Amino acid sequence: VRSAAVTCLKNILATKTGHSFWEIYKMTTDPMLAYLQPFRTSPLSENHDIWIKTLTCAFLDSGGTKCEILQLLKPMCEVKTDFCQTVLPYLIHDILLQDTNESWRNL
Amino acid sequence: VSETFGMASHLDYLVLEWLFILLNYTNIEDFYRSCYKVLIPHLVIRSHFDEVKSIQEDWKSLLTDCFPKILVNILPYFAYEGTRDSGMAQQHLFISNLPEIVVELLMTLHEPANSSASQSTDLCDFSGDLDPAPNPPHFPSHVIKATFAYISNCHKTKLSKSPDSYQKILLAICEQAAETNNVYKKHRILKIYHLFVSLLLKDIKSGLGGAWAFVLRDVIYTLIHYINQRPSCIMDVSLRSFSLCCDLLSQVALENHLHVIVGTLIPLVYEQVEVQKQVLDLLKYLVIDNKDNENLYITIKLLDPFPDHVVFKDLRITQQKIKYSRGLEEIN
């Protein structure tokens, strides 16, 4: 129901690739909210890393010393870009959570 | 020359000369391979010309359809036609402080004393000097400032083009390209187009607000025209889009007729709690709006008469008890 925020919902189709959507068939039976997810979406995807310790002074400024606590999205983006690619869903959701809601970014 | 005062989308508009090589010569300055990326508007214009020629000067001008035979990229037309479907043009109570509470502060200049400064010929030597100054270039700030003090439903009061009869041309040409081809991707292109039609909300006061609502109503009518095809393609996404449109319209009006027509639930009688928010938003602004909106909001009472599959409705209609205030007593 948000305005100008439905563009990030398209990233769910890329994040629902066959690399982690193996449990979708098991979750679509018991739950009921999967009816709208399967109609919107349904190969795999991967990425790489560059640095590991590139968040020395940027990790201690999640909430920000000054006002405008919305800068936490920059810390999440920095902790998601230069990190391990083990969490394929969290790595694919980095482009969506960049301009998404603050609650979703914190979660 | 207006580019300097105010450039990639101009190629699709300049390619209309072939309907020739001037557009390709102008595009060759930067990249001659970007013709496929900006081909969406060209294909939309070609489809519009074919629709105008199938059923006038357009029928004779559409004879240049052979220019599009350079490639055979037919799969790229899935996400296209968005601009063709969105185009429908080229086809108040702040004086309640009557008591002394407003006497301490200033008062509203609504009497004849507000216009008591007609005799101003003494300062004419300074008025004329300021008129010839750069103030004439900013004088529009005073004329573009009186567009306030009005929160009424102006949308409830507002023949745009002829795209309804020319909408099934591509479907009849490409074997139901709007319904069968759109259902191959599980209505993904349809959802993307529905999102892009609403993302273009920039000036809904008196500009694009009069055309975006009409485009949304036309898209809803085209999606609801199919009984089995739309229920086989997608229903939850359509319900979510309708609920989002209703929630966006309730934030302000005449578009409630489209929601009422989509809420008939002829083949969609398998609804769920996803309509509770819409039923609450329709009843919230029911008695607060005008008589026209109060009469058009009879969709809630029409849906309340459903005797089958209405267990969840009877369980979550606890919020409908507010209709007894301005009774609307029969619904309560």
Element (H, E) at B146: none
CB-CB under 8 Å, A10 with B247: no
Cβ neighbours of A35 in B, within 8 Å: 236
Cβ neighbours of B247 in A, within 8 Å: 1
CB atoms within 10 A of CB B24: 14
Check if the beta carbon of residue A11 is closer than 8 Å to that of residue A92: yes
CB-CB under 8 Å, A39 with B235: yes
The CA-atom distances, in angstroms, between B300 and each of A98, B264, B284, B323, B332 are 40, 10, 11, 11, 11
The technique is cryo-EM
CA distance A39 to chain B (A): 6
CA distance B213 to chain A (A): 16
By residue count, chain A amounts to 107
Interface of A to B at Cβ within 8 Å reads: 1, 3-4, 6-7, 9-10, 13, 32, 35-36, 38-41
**Long-range contact set of residues B53-61: C-beta below 8 Å, sequence gap at least 24:** B54/B169, B55/B165, B55/B166, B55/B169, B61/B19
- What residue spans of chain B are helical by DSSP H? 2-5, 10-14, 21-27, 39-54, 57-61, 82-86, 124-130, 135-138, 140-143, 169-173, 188-199, 209-224, 229-233, 236-249, 256-262, 276-284, 291-296, 299-303, 311-316
Which member of A1, A7, A40 has the closest CB to residue B237?
A: A40
CA distance A9 to chain B (A): 10
- Enter the tokens of residue B2: 């207006």
CB-CB under 8 Å, A35 with B236: yes
CB atoms within 10 A of CB B159: 3
In sequence order, what DSSP letters do the residues of B270-284 get, joined into one string?
A: ---GGGHHHHHHHHH
Rg (CA), chain B: 27
Taking CA B57 as the corner, what is the angle to CA B51 and CA B63, rounded to the nearest 5 degrees?
Answer: 60
User: Helices (H) and strands (E) in chain A — how many of each?
Assistant: 6, 0
Residues 6+ apart with CB under 8 A from B248: A3, B198
Check if the beta carbon of residue B52 is closer than 8 Å to that of residue B59: yes
Q: Chain B residue with minimal CA distance to A4? A: B199
Is the dihedral angle over the CA atoms B46, B218, B247, A92 positive or is it negative? negative
Taking CA A26 as the corner, what is the angle to CA A24 and CA A29, rounded to the nearest 5 degrees?
Answer: 100
Cβ neighbours of B240 in A, within 8 Å: 36
Q: Does residue A97 sit in helix, strand or coil?
A: coil
Q: How crowded is the C-beta side of B211, counted as CA atoms within 13 Å?
A: 18
- DSSP state for residue B78 in the 8-state scheme: S
Cβ neighbours of A4 in B, within 8 Å: 199
List the single best residue of A2, A3, A8, A42 to mutate versus B (max B Cβ within 10 A).
A3
CA distance A72 to chain B (A): 26
Residue B207 backbone class (left: φ over 0; alpha: ψ -120 to 50; beta: rest): alpha
